[PDB]
């Protein structure tokens, strides 16, 4: 119980931090601002394999309702990373500047169960979970 208790807040912060930048401005005092946002550090650590892995297993093992929320965050988090993984690599990283991306993909694309599990999620009536699960496979492909 305690486990989920701590895990949930971190996921929430994790998600917020990702949001804590507006990527669309670029896609659609700048250097300093880019240095300052937490999004940079967040991505940096997320790439670390204990970090991504932990996030991933949450998806593998799904279902109280409280636990379910943790799951939603897990998925949303990954989706956001995938969406702007590129932005981090090419836009953000150089500005501040530490190391590259590859380990994350093999863990996601090659781990099969994660892919299978996400597929299974689409059916589920939480729309947040299903809608997002659908998106992830798209990004991964």
């Amino acid at each position: 119980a305690e486990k989920w208790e701590v895990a949930e807040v971190v996921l929430e912060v994790f998600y917020k931090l990702l949001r804590d930048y507006e990527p669309q401005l670029e896609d659609f005092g700048e250097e300093i601002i880019a240095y300052k946002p937490p999004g940079f550090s967040l991505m940096y650590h997320l790439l670390n394999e204990p970090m991504l892995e932990l996030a991933l297993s949450l998806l593998e093992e799904g279902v109280k309702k409280h636990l379910e929320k943790a799951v939603q965050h897990c998925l949303a988090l990954l989706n956001l990373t995938l969406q702007k993984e590129n932005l981090f690599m090419d836009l953000l990283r150089e500005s501040q500047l530490v190391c590259p991306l590859e380990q994350l993909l093999q863990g996601i694309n090659p781990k099969a169960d994660n892919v299978v599990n996400i597929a299974r999620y689409l059916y589920h009536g939480n729309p947040e979970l299903a809608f997002e699960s659908a998106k992830i496979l798209c990004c991964i492909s």
């Binding site: 804590d20 507006e22 401005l25 670029e26 700048e30 601002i33 240095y35 300052k36 946002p37 500005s95």
Partner: protein
């Protein structure tokens, strides 16, 4: 490279008028100048085949090819870039031309807004490369480089004043927006005398 599309700059600007670090982080596109790509011959062959790639690819019809070609000639601009400009904006008659100026228009404006309006993390970010400061004078010179007149002289026979005035308007405003930026920097107080001497010479 830089996004040749007008829309992102427009949206970002409206945001500030909301600022999303994410879009802004896209960052250096606020170069101002389209320094690196000019008209390219190599680019033409790619274009003429009617298959072009962007920095997916698209089949390109003859009609589109002509519009793209006119752009390169008119603005001494790279052919592929000219293409991205057309794609981004609704294809209608010389729509790419519009996006070309529009892209520059808000980019300059945004820089102007930040430097003048804001005191802030972002102001620091934009200035920090100390890419903007270098570019400011050159951006001005870019406006100056006589492209329009030569064409007119060549044109004298079948003259098309109206299209020219259109260009002249966009450029003049650009120079005007540039004025605010330079002024804003002064308030911003960049480091020193070297700039002033260069500017006085300029």
């Amino acid at each position: 490279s830089a996004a040749s599309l007008w829309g992102p700059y427009k949206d970002i600007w409206h945001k500030v008028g909301l600022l999303d670090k994410i879009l802004k982080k896209h960052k250096p596109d606020f170069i101002s100048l389209f320094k690196n790509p000019p008209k390219n011959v190599q680019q033409h062959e790619k274009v003429q085949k009617a298959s072009t790639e962007g920095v997916g690819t698209r089949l390109l019809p003859e009609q589109l090819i002509k519009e793209a070609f006119i752009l390169s000639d008119l603005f001494d601009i790279g052919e592929l870039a000219a293409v991205e400009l057309l794609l981004a904006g609704e294809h209608q008659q010389l729509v790419a031309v519009l996006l070309y100026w529009d892209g520059k228009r808000c980019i300059a404006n945004s820089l102007k807004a930040l430097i003048q309006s804001r005191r802030p993390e972002l102001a620091s970010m934009t200035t920090r490369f100390t890419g903007l400061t270098y570019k400011v004078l050159t951006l001005v010179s870019q406006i100056d480089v006589n492209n329009e007149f030569e064409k007119l002289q060549r044109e004298r026979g079948l003259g098309s004043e109206k299209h020219r005035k259109e260009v002249s308007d966009l450029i003049k405003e650009c120079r005007q927006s540039l004025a605010e930026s330079l002024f804003a920097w002064a308030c911003q107080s960049p480091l020193g005398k070297e700039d002033t001497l260069l500017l006085i010479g300029h």
